[PDB]
Ligand binder design. Structure first.
Ligand SMILES: Nc1ncnc2c1ncn2[C@@H]1O[C@H](COP(=O)(O)OC(=O)[C@@H](N)CC(=O)O)[C@@H](O)[C@H]1O
Ligand SMILES: Nc1ncnc2c1ncn2[C@@H]1O[C@H](COP(=O)(O)O)[C@@H](O)[C@H]1O
Length: 585
RNA sequence: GGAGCGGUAGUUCAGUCGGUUAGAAUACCUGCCUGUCACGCAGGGGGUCGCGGGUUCGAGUCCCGUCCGUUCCGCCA
């Protein structure tokens, strides 16, 4: 029904008859003259209506925003006067010889003249997706997947699909379940990732695998989290972590080059320990120049238990955050920050306004000065390299609270005071993550996942000293976003079994839930390692949104709902009956 | 499970430490306009303040419950 896409018409088309299909982006009725900006995915084109073609003109008067129309006309260069230089089709327009209204559009539930509410935009996602800004992110995402596939294929990775109807197994995130019609009382679990299958594909002899696959984790959301999302899943055999990182880094450098014309350069590498030490984060945003400064060894003897406790406790920490120019923060702003760190568990937010270091105690306003002394403060100021007019904030607690509260404060302040170079691209690898994480109940949980190999330990060693063991795992982070992560896998049954034991998974549960894995490990399993990227997050970064919803055609709300279709919904009892389940009273 | 913010014509935004016909923009309808491109110009109708309950002489404004969006904490192979 079309011979050309509106948005592609140029002077080079002048004199041609074309038929266009699209929508009325805008309608300008000047009485005996009507301008119709016709839109389709390639852009907007001006369609002109003269009293010369009274019929076409008269009909064109019925045109309202978003009406779907077909127009046949002649392309003619517009008078040097009128030529619009802000339109790709500016130096031309189409003289309408024929107009057809494919479909009217009722009153729009979204007014293109306003920034509409996220709720209305999701409810009428199909209308929202008509906007170029939105549409463009999806087009770009398709270019990214296209670039990924060509690259991965060119690097010998095999695109192998894995099942969505899988087995429910402990650890990780919460699984979405699918009740089985065939097996009363049994359920499938949607996959959190294809982790176990890609490892098995490795044990199958495929040597490099990848897949752009949907993942499902029944967890609440955030601006960068959706319960169903897409990974660029990757697995290799007979390769080390650095080798995996090398090709994975190359992919990302390729994507940035081809998509943004930006060369990211070699990725800096940082250990988990250093990232936590310096930024109180395992996904540090290196665009923010501020760092944390440990000052516990300076506060061991202060009387102030708020500092003395964390300072003396090896599980404690006192990290100072030097805020350039922060001395000018108002009492309001400081109270706000105080409340902000409370979100992360901090019990308070001691600070030191640095007015004049030369003046010692008299050069600094600090509700905590009274607990310190000139020496301590001078030491703190030196180690933080504080300058006149700066502010020093303190995080004093168990290691986690300090990192969470101060790492978070660090980021917030950097944005608030514009200290963070927004333009810059900051990719990095975070490596040497711990194998395990305290579960708060006396146990240990997998930092990444149970199938992650320890960096340089034997099963016996890992079992003897698990809490400190370093995993051979790694995350790729860009501008403070975790965009991907992986690890070298355990290719030895004894080690897998040892890890399950450390995790508190008894033999029964091991056989029950990972028996097929333990068994598979008995048949010449090759060393293997992989990684997975968050396609959505990569796309957010590449299209400049801070919202994951913007890179997903039909995302879910924070209530895991599809406002466009009204999912989820009550079930038909006939269905629940054949699935042998019921909603509890 | 928790905290913050929003919820006002179709859409969107404002709405004074509570004052009684609810403001506008946009949209829509009508009329005029032969070079607009955010066209312009002029007139018209439109919401009863997400929902239920309550305080009060009076509630869009306050309180409670609750629903929706959103940000965050918890949570997150
Ligand atoms: N809910 C979510 N919404 C949106 N994006 C998400 C979400 N969860 C994760 N991501 C993104 O996916 C990447 C891979 O996930 P992982 O947990 O590292 O590992 C895995 O699934 C391992 N099997 C990979 C491996 O070991 O090879 C993350 O880095 C992140 O960008
Ligand atoms: N647990 C804590 N961690 C960090 N700072 C704290 C903590 N408790 C109190 N503070 C701060 O230390 C100063 C003295 O606290 P207080 O003696 O409660 O007035 C104030 O700036 C508090 O906000």
């Amino acid at each position: 029904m079309r011979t050309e896409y509106c948005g592609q018409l140029r002077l080079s088309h002048v004199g041609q008859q074309v038929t266009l299909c699209g929508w009325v982006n805008r309608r300008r009725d000047l009485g005996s003259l009507i301008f119709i900006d016709m839109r389709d995915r390639e852009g907007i084109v001006q369609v002109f209506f003269d009293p010369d073609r009274a019929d076409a003109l008269k009909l064109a008067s019925e045109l309202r925003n978003e009406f779907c129309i077909q127009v046949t006309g002649t392309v003619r260069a517009r008078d040097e006067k009128n030529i619009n230089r802000d339109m790709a089709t500016g130096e031309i327009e189409v003289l309408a010889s024929s107009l057809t209204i494919i479909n009217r559009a009722d009153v729009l539930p979204l007014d293109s003249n306003h920034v509409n509410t996220e709720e209305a935009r999701l409810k009428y996602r199909y209308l929202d997706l008509r906007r170029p800004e939105m549409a463009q992110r999806l087009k770009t995402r398709a270019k990214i997947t296209s670039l990924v596939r060509r690259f991965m294929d060119d690097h010998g990775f095999l695109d192998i699909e894995t099942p969505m109807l899988t087995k429910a197994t402990p650890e990780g995130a919460r699984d979405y379940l699918v009740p089985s019609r065939v097996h009363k009382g049994k359920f499938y679990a949607l996959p959190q990732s294809p982790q176990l299958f890609k490892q098995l594909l490795m044990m199958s002899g495929f040597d490099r695998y990848y897949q752009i696959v949907k993942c499902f984790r029944d967890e609440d959301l955030r601006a960068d989290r959706q319960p169903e999302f897409t990974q660029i899943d990757v697995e290799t055999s007979f390769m080390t972590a650095p080798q995996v990182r090398e090709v994975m880094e190359a992919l990302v450098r390729h994507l940035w080059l081809e998509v943004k014309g930006v060369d990211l350069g070699d990725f800096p590498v940082m250990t988990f320990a250093e990232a936590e030490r310096r930024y109180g984060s395992d996904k540090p945003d290196l665009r923010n120049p501020m760092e944390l400064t440990d000052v516990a060894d300076l506060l061991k003897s202060v009387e102030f238990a708020v500092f003395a406790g964390p300072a003396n406790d090896p599980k404690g920490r006192v990290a100072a955050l030097r805020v350039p120019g922060g001395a000018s923060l108002t009492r309001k702003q400081i109270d706000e920050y105080g409340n902000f760190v409370k979100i992360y568990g901090a019990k308070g937010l001691a600070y030191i306004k640095v007015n004049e270091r030369a003046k010692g105690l008299e050069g600094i306003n600090s509700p905590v000065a009274k607990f310190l002394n000139a020496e301590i403060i001078e030491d703190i100021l030196d180690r933080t390299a504080a300058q006149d007019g700066d502010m020093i904030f303190f995080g004093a607690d168990n290691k986690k609270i300090v990192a969470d509260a101060m790492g978070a404060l660090r980021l917030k302040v950097g944005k608030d005071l514009g200290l963070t170079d927004e333009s810059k691209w900051a990719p990095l690898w975070v490596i040497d993550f711990p194998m395990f994480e305290d579960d708060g109940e006396g146990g240990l949980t997998a930092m990444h996942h149970p199938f992650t190999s320890p960096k340089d330990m034997t099963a016996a060693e890992l079992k003897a000293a698990p809490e400190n063991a370093v995993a051979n795992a790694y995350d790729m982070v860009i501008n403070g976003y975790e965009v991907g992560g992986g690890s070298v896998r355990i290719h030895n049954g004894d080690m897998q079994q040892t890890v399950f034991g450390i995790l508190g998974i008894n033999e029964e549960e091991q056989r029950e839930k990972f028996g097929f894995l333990l068994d598979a490990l008995k048949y010449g399993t090759p060393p293997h390692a992989g990684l997975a990227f968050g396609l959505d997050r990569l796309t957010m970064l590449l299209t400049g949104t801070d919202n994951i919803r913007d890179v997903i055609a039909f995302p879910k709300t924070t209530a895991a709902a599809c406002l466009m279709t009204e999912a989820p919904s009550f079930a038909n009892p006939t269905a629940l009956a054949e699935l042998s389940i019921q909603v509890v009273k």
